[PDB]
Motif scaffolding. Structure first.
Motif, PDB file in Angstrom:
ATOM      1  N   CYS A   1       1.133  -1.148   0.048  1.00 11.97           N
ATOM      2  CA  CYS A   1       0.146  -0.139  -0.008  1.00 11.97           C
ATOM      3  C   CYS A   1       0.924   1.189  -0.097  1.00 11.97           C
ATOM      4  CB  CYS A   1      -0.923  -0.099   1.268  1.00 11.97           C
ATOM      5  SG  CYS A   1      -2.492  -0.957   1.225  1.00 11.97           S
ATOM      6  N   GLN A   2       1.305   1.731  -1.040  1.00  7.96           N
ATOM      7  CA  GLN A   2       2.099   2.900  -1.339  1.00  7.96           C
ATOM      8  C   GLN A   2       1.454   4.138  -1.137  1.00  7.96           C
ATOM      9  OE1 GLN A   2       2.561   5.072  -4.077  1.00  7.96           O
ATOM     10  NE2 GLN A   2       4.291   6.211  -2.895  1.00  7.96           N
ATOM     11  N   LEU A   3       2.276   5.212  -0.623  1.00  5.49           N
ATOM     12  CA  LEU A   3       1.755   6.656  -0.370  1.00  5.49           C
ATOM     13  C   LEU A   3       1.132   7.326  -1.375  1.00  5.49           C
ATOM     14  CD1 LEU A   3       1.899   8.849   2.305  1.00  5.49           C
ATOM     15  CD2 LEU A   3       3.805   9.688   1.219  1.00  5.49           C
ATOM     16  N   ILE A   4      -0.020   8.146  -1.221  1.00  9.28           N
ATOM     17  CA  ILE A   4      -0.753   8.774  -2.295  1.00  9.28           C
ATOM     18  C   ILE A   4       0.131  10.080  -2.616  1.00  9.28           C
ATOM     19  CG2 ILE A   4      -2.752  10.138  -2.895  1.00  9.28           C
ATOM     20  CD1 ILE A   4      -2.926   7.381  -0.116  1.00  9.28           C
ATOM     21  N   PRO A   5       0.564  10.254  -4.055  1.00 15.44           N
ATOM     22  CA  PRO A   5       1.186  11.388  -4.204  1.00 15.44           C
ATOM     23  C   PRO A   5       0.543  12.522  -3.788  1.00 15.44           C
ATOM     24  CG  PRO A   5       0.977   9.876  -6.067  1.00 15.44           C
ATOM     25  CD  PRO A   5       0.164   9.452  -5.101  1.00 15.44           C
TER      26      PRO A   5
END
Lengths: 771, 771
Positions: B508-512
């Motif tokens: 779950c990668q950080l939202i830009p």
């Protein structure tokens, strides 16, 4: 042994003598269970061999053997039976059927050895339920009912009385445990016979254990039926302990196949034996067997090989005390007494059933032939069993004989009772049990009317019954008071709106409806003020119409006084119209008139101020009338024409309104629920008309060469400003549970009346006493 | 019969001859299963009677009987056994143990009759699992393993390979059905051996049924292991049908106790037999028995009473074809061939176990005495069984002998395999099974590496596995794409906010995060306008400071131009400050300066208008400066001093903001989320200051003897009114998902710049080229 010769030889086993602990059968020759059964079997055989239409020309013979009340000893006899399957040799005989094994222990392994050799036996005094399975005793059969056909009867008599909660005593042995297990197995099938406890007594009770068990029975007092399976001494000791413990009138005993009709279990316990459902096996007596047995002598029966010992022990003679050879030639009553043994109606039945099976066999294989047959020279065990298990006939004492698939005869019991009767003792029959329950509940006397042993007393409408888990027998009731209705007997669901649960047996009664009406404590003030106001306004209009040409009028009244008076009148009309019940129309016209009245008043005053100022710095009378009647009134006339504030009557019926918790009492309102924002918009428009007049009165605070009317205009505008500033927080004093229709309505009507009075009383109402 | 005399006589039963359908045993004398077992038992007895430390001075004797492969015929022999329990009479002997009942049918009811008489038998070729219950065969025992100890082995070899999904064939009989039932019973205990199907073949297959069953096996292709329990011809026909049906390379056969190592079930089916897990009973050969049996003649063995018939059928001689008396004096190879029977290692074991039990009995009852004992003159069945069931010793072929509580010897099997090898056939051992599993998986060759029969192929991270119900064997995987994270291997729960599931293996990668910054497509316009505006304002201030004494200035600028210029400068400062990134401080000063600037400008213009009007109808320069610097500015200075609009930096981090569905892409904002109502209140205050100036400019639209400045004041107020009326709906154009920071910010900054330019460009910016 008794070697009677016959075309079809069937053997037998009998309990003659007893268990010899010394390694040799101890001489007993009980002669009640031993002799009375050999003689009965031989009597049956002799009768069958003398009937022209039972076995026709065929005859029967019997090889009788003696089991000395033991199993292992019975084994050699059982082996002796099968001796035609393995030097003056004697050709041995082939047994076609064995009647014997009275003791249930002998029956088991005798059945084992005989089923290993295809020989159908028919027992007569073996009631153990374990012999009712066609997987180890497939060739077994019995004329006596099994012990598992009694418990069911108990269940029936438990059910037919009404009891749903009972105890279950159980002695230590094969009888009591099997009976209680059968009762429990039948319990689950139909239910409604929920067993509270299941006690257990030892064979040898240690000192002081009976009271413990009886107090265990006193755990749940609501279980007052004791279904006992015990022995004579156990019954006596339980009843004696109960009597001593001072717990009488609390137990309803339920007998078994061991309590019967004896007066021995209760000698001094007659007082504490009230109530008995003892179930005893149906009995009878055979006159033919008596006529046979009492007419025998020591030289009339050589067949029997134990008859000398019976002629010795029945008379004390020892041959060779008293060395008396003959004595009682008739052994009926000469010496001692005669008592036909109980289980003498079940050996004749076995013999007769075997004979009937053989007869049926002879009628199908090779019909049309008298005597023995080439198809009948060797009987087969399977076919003989099939014919045995399909017999239906009336035997001794007129009792039908029939077997199930297993080979278990149906049960036929009688039911007794035990109660005091004029200081005596008596076991009257209170019914019987022959494939069904038959009772005499009219002839029953629980010395209480009819007692009961139900777990939970029946519940009452108003308090919901919930069935407990594990046993659907003890329903617990819980009260669900509140805003809820009983949809069904148990569940009390939400009672719908406008429908309030009541205090009756069951119901949801309509909520009372309230509304302010003409007569009320908070109603006299506004109507009194309004009637006084209209009286004052009528007085004023009388003054103005009585003198119009007078020059004092010519300072006004050309086109302004009419409109201003109309507005003042409509204000009091509002005062009377607000408080009336808004059933259908009253609330409809409310907004329209509420606008129009103060609109007339304030617009007239505004145009008066504007025109006096303009002429101080187009005052034509029709021109002024046109600019007054349509300046601000036309706005509200068009607003009325296209309904914006006057919606179609909502008449929101206040079923809920203030949702009164704990609904023992509540209220309902018939208000016309036009939103408060309509009041806001009407007030806002009126204040908008007021603002310009107030400002333009402020600006010309002092004006020369002007009539005395110019100052009271300002004074009334100031007073109205003050009263409205004081009023608006009272409007914002609403939204309180106390009084939604007592505060706001009185506030509004009093404010309207006071504004009307101020505009009237202080402006042109004075300076009229002069005119 | 063979009546050998001895102190302790133990009998036996053997299958000599066969079932005679004619009502008399048909002469067969199979002599493989009949003779080789009497001779083996007699050899064992003769060896035991010649060992100085086995039974000491006691000797043994044997009564051998002949069961003609039938049950009922065996019954008379069993009765003959018990003849010491019931005229030159011969005293009969008491049997202490029976070794016999090879056929499993004889074993059952022989066990019944013998357990009725307390005689412990030890069978040697009876493997039916139904004889393993101590409730009908309590006195039974066996040296051969039961058939229920093989299925477990199969399970082990099923598990140790890795298979979790198999089929189960089952022939019609007692062997196959019992074996498959045992396998299923062991299946549930540990699981992981989920059975797909359970087929069933008839004893006599109707034409065209094999293909039906094989296609039934082809229902689930993922089950490629067939655990068969059938007979030789059934195996052959199944394999032939499979070969014909063209479904090779798809099945992995699992043998049983009927496939062994024979080449007969596959003659032409060598191709379609690849793979075998056939389980065969461990075997051996006894040299002593061979030396005994091959050294017998027709005058060296009179003990045996069927040895003449064996000397006849083994040589064709008929005594009295060829009428040859002697022929093969040595019967090893002279005529025909010799083949020691397989089950000859289980009668010697039975005899030895009985002898060991008797020896152990003699060592405990009355120790210290040689010979027979007064405590040993009558053996007891219970004690003898207790001693039998506690023996541990090495017998023939070095195989330990031991029994369980029931009396079942542990199993010892070997496991084979069948595969092509240079165009030949070979059953190599691939392991064994002696109380555990032993394998040779290195020596295994599935002519595929290692195949498998698992239901579901292993799943993959990203797609959640759910276990199906009823069998925890076939997990179904379902894809849960979306806004969710895999907490554990299976469950994919909600992925927390600020944490967006990615396209990697799992994550779950950080939202830009996005925000308008200095360089942007919607950023050049306001900064360009603002720099041009400050250039213009600097030009204007240069003009005003280069000439101040000039009388053209004396129409203004005493105390008003400074404040108005400060306001115009602060408006462009707002223009530059709104768009900057509001990291820490930029949004803090925003409200303060936004107020102060336009406050200065508009309050200065308002006081200018009020003072010019008042002097047209206290203009002292310091007095005017005091009434301008604090008329409306002090209000905002106190508002700033007590923070109402300027809250502590919210910096509401826009993790959600517009919640983007299908989160393959999304956005995050770093806006300083001061509510729009703060903009509303600032604008409202500024417009409140504007209203009075606009009204008082309207009123004096035309004024004589006044400088030319009076009209542009009104013109600028009109233009600002118009621009603000146009602006406010654009403010109300927000709350749209399109652009929350591109519309409002550009709108506000352009409106500010245009208002500043209008107030500047049209009012005092002109009429300066003259000066």
């Amino acid at each position: 042994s008794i070697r009677v010769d016959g075309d079809i030889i069937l053997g037998g086993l009998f309990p003659v003598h007893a268990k010899g602990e010394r390694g040799v059968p101890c001489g007993e020759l009980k002669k009640e269970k031993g002799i009375h059964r050999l003689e009965a079997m031989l009597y049956a055989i002799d009768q069958i061999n003398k009937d022209p239409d039972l076995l026709s020309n065929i005859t029967l013979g019997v090889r009788i053997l003696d089991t000395c009340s033991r199993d292992t000893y019975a084994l050699e006899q059982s082996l002796t039976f099968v001796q035609a399957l393995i030097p003056i040799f004697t050709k041995p005989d082939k047994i076609s059927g064995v009647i014997g094994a009275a003791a249930s222990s002998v029956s088991i392994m005798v059945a084992n050895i005989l089923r290993l050799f295809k020989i159908p036996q028919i027992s007569y005094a073996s009631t153990a339920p374990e012999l009712s399975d066609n997987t180890r005793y497939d060739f077994f059969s019995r004329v006596v009912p099994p012990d598992s056909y009694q418990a069911q009867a108990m269940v029936d008599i438990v059910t037919a009385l009404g009891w749903n909660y009972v105890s279950t005593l159980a002695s230590e042995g094969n009888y009591g445990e099997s009976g209680v297990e059968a009762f429990t197995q039948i319990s689950r099938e139909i239910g409604g016979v929920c067993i509270a406890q299941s006690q257990k007594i030892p064979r040898e009770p240690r000192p002081g254990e009976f009271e413990k068990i009886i107090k265990r029975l006193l755990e749940t007092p609501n279980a007052r039926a004791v279904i006992m399976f015990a022995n004579e001494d156990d019954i006596r000791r339980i009843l004696e302990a109960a009597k001593k413990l001072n717990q009488s009138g609390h137990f309803l005993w339920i007998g078994s196949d061991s309590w019967g009709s004896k007066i021995a279990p209760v000698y001094q316990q007659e007082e504490i034996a009230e109530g008995a459902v003892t179930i005893l096996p149906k009995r009878a007596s055979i006159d033919g067997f008596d006529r046979y047995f009492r007419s025998r002598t020591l030289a009339n029966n050589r067949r029997n090989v134990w008859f000398a010992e019976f002629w010795e022990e029945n008379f004390g003679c020892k041959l060779g005390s008293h060395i008396k050879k003959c004595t009682g030639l008739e052994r009926i009553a000469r010496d001692s007494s005669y008592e036909q043994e109980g289980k003498v109606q079940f050996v004749i039945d076995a013999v007769y059933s075997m004979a009937y099976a053989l007869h049926n066999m002879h009628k199908d294989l090779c019909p049309g032939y008298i005597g023995l047959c080439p198809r009948m020279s060797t009987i087969d065990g399977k076919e003989l069993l099939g014919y045995i298990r399909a017999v239906n006939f009336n035997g001794s004492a007129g009792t039908p004989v029939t077997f199930n698939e297993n080979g278990d005869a149906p049960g036929r019991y009688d039911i007794f009772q035990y109660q005091i009767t004029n200081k005596s003792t008596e076991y009257k029959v209170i019914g019987h049990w022959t494939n069904q329950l038959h009772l005499k509940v009219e002839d029953m006397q629980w010395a209480h009317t009819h007692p009961a042993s139900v777990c939970s007393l029946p519940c009452k409408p108003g308090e919901r019954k919930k069935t407990v888990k594990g046993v659907p027998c003890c329903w617990h009731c819980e009260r669900c008071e509140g805003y809820n209705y009983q949809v069904d007997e148990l569940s009390c669901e939400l009672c719908p709106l406008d429908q309030r649960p009541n205090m009756n047996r069951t119901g949801c009664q309509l909520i009372p409806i309230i509304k302010l009406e003409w007569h009320s404590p908070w109603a006299v003030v506004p109507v009194f003020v309004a009637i006084l106001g209209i009286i004052a306004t009528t007085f004023v209009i009388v003054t103005f119409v009585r003198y119009n040409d007078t020059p004092i009028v010519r300072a006004s009244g050309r086109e302004l006084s009419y409109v201003l008076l109309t507005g003042i009148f409509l204000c009091y009309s509002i005062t009377f119209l607000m408080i009336a019940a808004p059933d259908t129309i009253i609330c409809s016209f409310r907004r329209v008139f509420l606008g129009l009245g103060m609109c007339f008043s304030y617009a007239a005053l505004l145009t008066k101020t504007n025109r006096i100022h303009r002429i101080f710095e187009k005052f034509i009378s029709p021109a002024s009338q046109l600019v007054i009647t349509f300046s601000l009134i036309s706005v509200q006339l068009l607003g009325v024409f296209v309904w914006f504030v006057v919606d179609p009557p909502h008449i929101i019926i206040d079923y809920g309104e203030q949702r009164t918790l704990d609904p023992e009492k509540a209220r309902g309102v018939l208000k016309c629920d036009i939103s408060d924002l309509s009041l806001i918009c009407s007030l806002g428009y009126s204040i908008l008309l007021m603002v310009t007049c107030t400002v333009y009165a402020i600006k010309t605070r002092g004006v020369p060469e002007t009539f005395n009317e110019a100052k009271p205009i300002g004074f009334t505008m100031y007073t109205t400003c003050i009263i409205w500033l004081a009023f608006i927080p009272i409007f914002f004093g609403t939204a309180q549970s106390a009084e939604k229709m007592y505060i706001q309505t009185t506030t509004l009507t009093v404010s309207m009346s006071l504004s009307a009075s101020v505009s009237l009383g202080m402006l042109y109402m004075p300076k009229v006493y002069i005119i």
